[PDB]
Amino acid sequence: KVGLLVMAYGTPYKDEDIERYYTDIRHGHKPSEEMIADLRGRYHAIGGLSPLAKITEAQAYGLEKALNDSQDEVEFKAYIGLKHIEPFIEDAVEAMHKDGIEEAISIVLAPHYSSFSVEAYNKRAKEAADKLGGPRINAINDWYKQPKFIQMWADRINETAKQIPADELLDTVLIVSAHSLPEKIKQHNDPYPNQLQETADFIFEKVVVPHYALGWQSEGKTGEPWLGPDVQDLTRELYGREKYKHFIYTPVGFVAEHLEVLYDNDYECKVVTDEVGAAYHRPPMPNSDPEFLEVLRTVVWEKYSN
Ligand SMILES: CC1=C(CCC(=O)O)c2cc3nc(cc4[nH]c(cc5[nH]c(cc1n2)c(C)c5CCC(=O)O)c(CCC(=O)O)c4C)C(CCC(=O)O)=C3C
Ligand SMILES: [Fe+2]
C-alpha cells in the first residue's frame, strides 16, 4: 500500500467560501471588499462556482483506479491535498500518516515546475511528513515531457484545426499559455518559462497548425512585472501584424476547466478575438478523460519503477 499524494490548487466549495479562499491565496492578508467583489463577479460570470473540485476529484481517484487496474505489484491509495482550501496538503499527509502509510509518491496536477508552484507544493508536503514522522514523500517535480502528454494536446489541436477551412489554416495560429508568474523568476534560472517554451515547441511539431506563439495569463494584482506577453495582448499584436483569422488557445499549464480557463480564456480572449473579428477556439481541457488518466498513470508508474 503506497499513498498517492495528488495535489492541486483548490477552489471554493460554496460562495460563502470565497473570502477565506482569497485570504489564503494572499498568504493570510484579507483582501479588500473591492478585490473580493471582482473575484465573486468572475465566479458569477462563469455560472457561480468552478467545477474544479469535482474534476480534481475524478482526476485523483481515476488515477488511483488506473494505476490499480494495470498492475498488481502495488496497491495505491489516493489522498487529495489542496493548496488553498481543505483538505489541505498537510491534511492529506496527516491522513496518510494516521492510516499507516509508510511511503507515498506525490504529483501536482500541473505539468510544469516553478519555485512558485510545484516547489511550494513539495515543500509543504515534506514539512508535514517530517513533523509527523511519515510517510516518506517521493515527489514528482514535473511531467510535461511525458510523450503521451504532448500527444494528447496535439490530438486536441488537430481535431479542432481539421474543422478550419484549408483556405484559412494558413491564417490560423496556436496560442500556448500557462499561469503567469512574477518575471523575477527569470533572474534566478527558474525552469518554468523554458519548460513552457519546450512544451509549445513539442506540440507545434505534431500539429497541422502552421503558426504558434507562447503567452501567459492570469497575472496577479501586484506592483511588479509579470511574465509576458499576456494572451490578450499577444492576440492583439499577432492580429495587427499577421491579421490571423483563427486563434486556438491551449493553456497547457492547466489540466482542467476552471476559473482561469472559463473566464481568462473563454471570456477575455474571446472578447479580443471578437474585437478584431477573428474566430475563437479553445479545445477541451484534459479534465478526467481516459487519455489523460493514462498520461498520469504512466507518469506515476514510471516514477515508482525508479
Ligand atoms: C502558478 C499558478 C498556478 C498553476 C496551477 C496550479 O498550481 O495548480 C495557479 C492555478 C490556479 N489559480 C487559481 C485561482 C486563483 N489564483 C490567484 C492568484 C495567484 N495564482 C498564482 C499562481 C498560480 N495559480 C499567483 C502567483 C497568484 C497571485 C497571488 C497574490 O495576489 O499574491 C487568485 C486570486 C485572484 C487573482 O489573482 O485573480 C485566484 C482566484 C485556480 C483555480 C481557480 C478556481 O477555479 O477557483 C487555479 C487552478
Ligand atoms: Fe492562482
Residue numbers in the entry: 4 to 309
Lines from the paper:
Coproporphyrin ferrochelatase (CpfC) in the CPD heme biosynthesis pathway incorporates ferrous iron into coproporphyrin III (cpIII) to give coproheme, which is eventually decarboxylated to yield heme b by the coproheme decarboxylase enzyme in the final step of this biosynthetic process (Dailey et al., 2017; Dailey & Gerdes, 2015; Layer, 2021). Understanding structure–function relationships of key enzymes, such as ferrochelatase, is an essential precondition for the design of new inhibitors for antibiotic‐resistant pathogens, like Listeria monocytogenes. LmCpfC crystals in complex with cpIII were soaked with a ferrous iron solution and flash‐vitrified after 2, 3, and 4 min, to obtain snapshots of the enzymatic reaction during iron insertion into the porphyrin macrocycle. We report three crystal structures showing different iron content during metalation in LmCpfC, identifying the presence and defining the extent of the porphyrin distortions during iron insertion.
Interestingly, in the “68% Fe” structure, we observe a continuous electron density from the distal histidine (H182) to the proximal tyrosine (Y12). Ring A with the substituent p2 exhibits the highest distortion in the “34% Fe” structure (+12.6°), +9.2° in the cpIII structure and lowered values for the “24% Fe” (+4.8°), and the “68% Fe” (+1.9°) structures; in ring B (p4) the angle is altered the most in the analyzed samples (−13.4°, −10.5°, −11.4°, and −6.7°) as a function of the site occupancy by Fe ions, exhibiting a high degree of distortion compared to the coproheme structure. The measured change of angles throughout the ferrous iron insertion process at the site of p7 at pyrrole ring D is also peculiar: the rings in the substrate‐ and product‐bound states overlap well for all structures besides the “24% Fe” structure (−2.1° in the cpIII‐structure, −1.6° in the "68% Fe" structure, and −1.4° in the "34% Fe" structure). In the “24% iron occupancy” and in the coproheme‐bound structures, the guanidinium group points toward p7, while in the “68% iron occupancy” structure, being in a split conformation, partially points outwards since one conformation is 5.4 Å from p7. Nevertheless, a definitive conclusion cannot be drawn as the ionic radius of the ferrous iron in the “24% Fe”, “34% Fe”, and “68% Fe” structures is larger than the ionic radius of the ferric ion in the coproheme product and would result in an out‐of‐plane position regardless of the side from which it is approaching.
